[PDB]
Write a protein that binds this ligand. Sequence first.
Ligand SMILES: [Zn+2]
Lengths: 31, 72, 73
Amino acid sequence: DEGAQWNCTACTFLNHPALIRCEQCEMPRHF
Amino acid sequence: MQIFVKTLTGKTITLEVEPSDTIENVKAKIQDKEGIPPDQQRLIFAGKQLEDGRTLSDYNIQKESTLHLVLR
Amino acid sequence: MQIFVKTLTGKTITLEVEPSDTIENVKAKIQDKEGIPPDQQRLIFAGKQLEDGRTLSDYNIQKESTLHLVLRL
Ligand SMILES: [Zn+2]
């Protein structure tokens, strides 16, 4: 699951696992 | 057809559109309703950044679907 | 053409690039502006990690678009 993509909970964008903030809206992944 | 456009503040904008409208047309309707220039709009639907030349139906955007508006 | 690079600490870097530039060339330009060695740079665009040997045009990166830089230690 650590290499999995992840959906931003604010805008839903499907993000790369290397980012810990959303590429679109910069919402943090770990809130 | 009504769809919803949700901002990052959680505000839900109700927009009247046609199912065959292009994304560019939708941005123009957001410009008409909210006054936001289309070049400053990014729309996300179910994980995907929406591209200007495609239609709402192309993306399976339906009645009362929610698009997420991020300002760039 | 201009492209922008966003870092995790919020900095914006503006680069001058051609669409034919490789990702390696882009990392070298980031090093000039920042000081981060290219082998510690990861570039993300549209949810994908960009590969050193390919070019901006390979990823359809256009004028005034934005890449995200994260670090690899
Ligand atoms: Zn987001």
